[PDB]
């Protein structure tokens, strides 16, 4: 259970004592800090828990997806001490003129930098980072950050590696709350997604709404390679939206049959029900997605499940006018089911 932690917020000139749960993700502790600060900070999602530089150690941001227990507390203080800091560029073992740093980060120069990223001018980007540019910023018009923009370009691996070596945070979110991993996934940029994961970016990053990149892929459809890449890198399944739709519910509503098959192969819970009690098969019946319903039945979905309206998938299909789909459900027999031959293998990193 939870422990008393002192969190310092230097931007607010405040300290707060929170109970934080070490057996829960850092993300969860961050949420608790944000709540108790009733006065919302600007671009709050970018603020992160921070381990202050101690003796013979450097300052580091806590990993959002890692459990809080992974960061054992400094014993220097009577209570454990963390800070809540904006995810600014870290110039570890770097000292530069305040005005020179100010000159580097002018609106014009940040726009120039974003132009270099867009033009794929890797060497010019690297030289500016070498001189101390902080890549953790937003373009005013686009709302993109350098890393999120690079993640949408072809052959982005060079830019992504250079930006990360130059201090770009992998979880820096855009004005809309999306990380670089979200952006690569949405654009179906498999090369950029693979490099982000190779660089240590988590596959479970949450957006403003709490939806992960994998969830976005299921909503988006199209080339299913990115979906598979996330799942292969141990992306977590079973994320829900406000109405309790999981990834398979979304894939089924829109007929994204390739996304569905990947999700099912990697262990998605077929019996998960949303707020209405509808399973993925109910969703197929509601939206007349016969291609998806066949996959669900074939892989062993339970067709007997009733929603909270006491309706089976079959009954939902009939009520919706999907008579051909309903006959596929009715006609199906248990002997038809073929369980997956092989269990998934996952990426080493």
């Amino acid at each position: 259970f939870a422990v008393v932690v002192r969190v310092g917020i230097p931007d607010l000139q405040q300290t707060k004592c929170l109970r934080l749960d070490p057996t829960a993700p850092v993300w969860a502790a961050k949420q608790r800090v944000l709540c108790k600060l009733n006065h919302s900070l600007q671009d709050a999602l970018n603020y992160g828990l921070f381990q202050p530089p101690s003796r013979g150690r450097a300052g580091k941001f806590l990993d959002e997806e890692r459990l809080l227990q992974d960061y054992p507390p400094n014993l220097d203080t009577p209570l454990p001490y963390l800070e809540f800091r904006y995810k600014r560029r870290v110039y570890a073992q770097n000292l530069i003129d305040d005005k020179q740093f100010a000159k580097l980060h002018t609106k014009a120069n940040l726009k120039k930098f974003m132009d270099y990223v867009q033009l794929h001018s890797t060497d010019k980007v690297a030289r500016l980072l070498d001189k101390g540019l902080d890549p953790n910023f937003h373009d005013p018009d686009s709302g993109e950050c350098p890393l999120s923009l690079a993640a949408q370009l072809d052959n982005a691996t060079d830019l992504l590696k250079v930006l990360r070596n130059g201090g770009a945070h992998l979880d820096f979110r855009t004005r809309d709350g999306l990380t670089a991993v979200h952006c690569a996934t949405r654009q179906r940029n498999a090369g950029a997604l693979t490099t982000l994961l190779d660089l240590g970016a988590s596959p479970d990053y949450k957006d403003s709404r709490g939806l992960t990149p994998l969830y976005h892929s299921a909503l988006g459809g199209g080339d299913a390679r990115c979906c598979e890449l996330l799942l292969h890198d141990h992306a977590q399944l079973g994320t829900t939206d406000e109405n309790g739709w999981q990834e398979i519910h979304q894939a089924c509503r829109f007929g994204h049959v390739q996304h569905l098959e990947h999700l099912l192969f990697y262990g998605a819970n077929m019996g998960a029900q949303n707020a209405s009690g509808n399973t993925a098969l109910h969703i197929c019946a509601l939206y007349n997605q016969e291609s998806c319903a066949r996959v669900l039945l074939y892989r062993g979905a339970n067709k007997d499940v009733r929603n909270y309206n006491s309706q089976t998938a079959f009954q939902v299909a009939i009520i919706a006018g999907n008579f051909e789909l309903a006959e596929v459900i009715k006609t199906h027999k248990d002997s038809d089911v073929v369980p997956f031959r092989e269990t998934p293998s996952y990426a080493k990193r």
Binding site: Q14, T15, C17, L79
Partner: protein
Amino acid sequence: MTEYKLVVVGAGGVGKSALTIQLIQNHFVDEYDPTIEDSYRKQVVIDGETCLLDILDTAGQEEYSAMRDQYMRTGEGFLCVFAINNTKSFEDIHQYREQIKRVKDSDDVPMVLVGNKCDLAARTVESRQAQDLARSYGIPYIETSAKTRQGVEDAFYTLVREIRQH
């Protein structure tokens, strides 16, 4: 410039958090949020001098009674807060005063006696009894209401004045 460490010391639900919010954020906290330990810093001008205030809002519950020793050592002055409606808080002030003296190990520590919830109609603590207690202690007594911001600036500024004396 000077830095003054002010510690708000008081029983649970006495208005310590509400007083601190009024001085710093100029706003009244309606709902009941229990405190463990909260710190605020503010730049103010008192008697023609600009001074940084270090304000420590402490926990009224005995659950976090462990932290009491550390904050009493660091803080230069204390605001002992009791609710005018609640008699228990008034009686608890003696314990806090003794602990401050014991940890500080000095007869003279800057202290200010605050009676909160002045606005509440049903007052179970007379002004005179509080004034008598203040006189025995040799420190000022202020009646402060966080809801109307009445005397809030006076109580904190008075304590800064007490700190200046020693």
